[PDB]
Amino acid sequence: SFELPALPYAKDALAPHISAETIEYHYGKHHQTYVTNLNNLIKGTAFEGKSLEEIIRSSEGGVFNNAAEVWNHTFYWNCLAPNAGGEPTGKVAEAIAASFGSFADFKAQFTDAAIKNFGSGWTWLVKNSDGKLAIVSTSNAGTPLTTDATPLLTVDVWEHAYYIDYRNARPGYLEHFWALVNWEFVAKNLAA
Amino acid sequence: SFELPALPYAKDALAPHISAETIEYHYGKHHQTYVTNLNNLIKGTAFEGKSLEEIIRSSEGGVFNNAAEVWNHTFYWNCLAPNAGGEPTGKVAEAIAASFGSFADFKAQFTDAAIKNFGSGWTWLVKNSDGKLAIVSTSNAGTPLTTDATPLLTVDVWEHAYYIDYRNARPGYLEHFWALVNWEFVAKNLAA
Numbered sequence A, B: 001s002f003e004l005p006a007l008p009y010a011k012d013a014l015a016p017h018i019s020a021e022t023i024e025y026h027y028g029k030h031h032q033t034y035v036t037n038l039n040n041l042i043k044g045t046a047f048e049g050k051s052l053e054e055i056i057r058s059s060e061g062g063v064f065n066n067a068a069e070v071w072n073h074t075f076y077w078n079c080l081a082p083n084a085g086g087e088p089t090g091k092v093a094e095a096i097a098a099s100f101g102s103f104a105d106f107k108a109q110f111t112d113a114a115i116k117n118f119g120s121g122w123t124w125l126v127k128n129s130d131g132k133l134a135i136v137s138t139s140n141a142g143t144p145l146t147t148d149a150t151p152l153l154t155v156d157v158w159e160h161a162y163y164i165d166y167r168n169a170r171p172g173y174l175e176h177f178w179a180l181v182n183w184e185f186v187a188k189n190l191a192a
């Protein structure tokens, strides 16, 4: 069965940008529950033995929602880090400048997309199959994995991701997200 | 321009079932923001002169999302009250018993639907135009007003409705919702 991968840092490592309490609920309750529900829903089914990505690309309904959310959250935790944030360098910086005009342009576009992604969902930096970077949003458990675009960076805009720390101020959460971005992970994703 | 209608009670009236803090944010920030955003989108447009309902039934995208949420929240506050809850009497009791067998069955079914509603949204008791009652769930700003059916009761299951008080425990929030239901309002809705 699928297991909840260990958080890449201590539960308080993202403070004050994302609190230890947010981590305890978001990781320990929400993410854990998606793992448990996924395992239960796939027992005895043709989805047993399949990778998480394989399930995401071949499922609908509850199986999809849980599988995609498991993957999305693991991806999200890796997108964040202590002692990180700031501006990317190298190939990531160059690709962002080429695709959006500048890092500042990208940051504003990503922020705007995330803030205006209505309801629950995720906002993504992806590499489209044309080789160009783009910002796309998804609803609920939706993920670029069901397309031919490669996810590079994401922000969870489900209210549970930020409500403890920012209440209604999703834009405040976005401001603090930038202080946490793990560009090393983004660079790995782009290089792949 | 649209005004945020006054809350039917002070912000502590629903406590401890829904906290004063929740109401301060939910009414004073979320509901207010929907009003502000709606006004900004419709100013100087052909949506001026239209009632809230007329906008909801003739719009899409941002105009729709904001107009529907303004209406949904006003309806929600009217569905809740101090010194209420328990079970309906008279016409409402009769109608629910006729359509669901018993109030207890209705209560279980409504609760189940509300807990299963994935992501942000609303769960409703409606009266169809042939008089049948039904439980329906909607996503995000979705509302029975865009259908033929008449809303009788709703619960908001956006995480902002409960996260301060219940965190991830949406079922706890639902339990406490029942302690607040304003059956007088439900009766008005049914009698219209």
Ligand SMILES: [Fe+2]
Pocket (backbone or CB within 6 Å): A026, A030, A073, A156, A158, A160, A161
């Ligand atoms: Fe999440």
Ligand SMILES: [Fe+2]
Pocket (backbone or CB within 6 Å): B026, B030, B073, B156, B158, B160, B161
């Ligand atoms: Fe709400």
Ligand SMILES: [O]
Pocket (backbone or CB within 6 Å): A069, A156, A158
């Ligand atoms: O999420």
Ligand SMILES: [O]
Pocket (backbone or CB within 6 Å): B069, B156, B158
């Ligand atoms: O909401």
